[PDB]
Amino acid sequence: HMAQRAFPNPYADYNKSLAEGYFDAAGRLTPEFSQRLTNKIRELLQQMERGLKSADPRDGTGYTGWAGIAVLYLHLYDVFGDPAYLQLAHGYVKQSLNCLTKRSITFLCGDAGPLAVAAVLYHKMNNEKQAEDCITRLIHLNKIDPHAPNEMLYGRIGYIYALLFVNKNFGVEKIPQSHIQQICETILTSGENLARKRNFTAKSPLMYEWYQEYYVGAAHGLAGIYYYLMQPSLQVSQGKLHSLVKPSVDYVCQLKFPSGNYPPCIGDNRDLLVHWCHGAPGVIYMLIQAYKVFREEKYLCDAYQCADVIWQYGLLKKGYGLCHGSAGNAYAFLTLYNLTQDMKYLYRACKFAEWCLEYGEHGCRTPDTPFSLFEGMAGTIYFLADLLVPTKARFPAFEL
């Protein structure tokens, strides 16, 4: 069933010999592979620039719109150091700030994306006034939507990411920890309350839902929320980490299909989607973080299973995007590489990149937003550039 959604993987698995072309014994990419990545990046950027001329003027979001393009260029500026990338980022930021709708709080789908990205861009351009104005607006954005959900695209962890994004890039605590703490407390309270209401408590002390479904994965579901709650950034107490989060994580682990993949919602029987948004490519982050925090082998073994499912069924007919595509899937290998230091996973990432280097030659469907960060080409370009320094690579708009 997964098989019907993926191309057969044409590549051999890792060995020291096959890997020599890609990186040295220190996991550092060869000059040759680096340059081939760079050449593809330059080519695709050309097509992206042209394609974006036809994009909807009104959508400034990180997920499908202008702020997402700015995310890419800030990244490219950091990777390559070319000033023209920072300038490109400026243009996209300006477009995005004209698109605030006041309807959502998240980095990916709300006003927090434009504002947080703008703060960082202005900062990088030594424009203190504009940077500080953006931070102010971002901080106050909290108020506009209480009773928001808890998930990534529309809920509280999506807003938290925006705050962390600012702090990371400024290198200082521009948004006070107390602001993050307050949101974290609301998430925990909400989780306990819903589990109590529905009598989940015995099997899962926390429970969350979005549009009246118990989503499991990174984009809308439990794996995304628990990944965040387990992050040192969010400063959940040891007490709550063990009494609330860990048993809830374990409940998710128990939902695993025999294949190693995960259902999109609790009770869903169809083992079909191998995406960041739904299934193993998104659930793996929770597993790896659980391993880092709790040091229980079961979490690591589950992560290995994810990587194997993705190696087999991860090259999607859906395309090359991040949310549900080969580049987003490839990030699962990098996260496991960065935990274990096992070059096998760096190798798998390089082969997924090899696939992306033949962009458009496989008969993949055209995305609804073909040039966007999460559905389209910007996300694929992001991944290729991030691979240049694998130890620093992070799935954008999500991974901490």
């Binding site: 997920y63 695209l153 984009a219 809308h220 999109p264 989607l273 948004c277 739904h278 949310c323 549900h324």
Partner: peptide, 6 residues
């Protein structure tokens, strides 16, 4: 569709 459907 809606953003991450099914």
């Amino acid at each position: 569709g809606f953003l991450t459907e099914y």
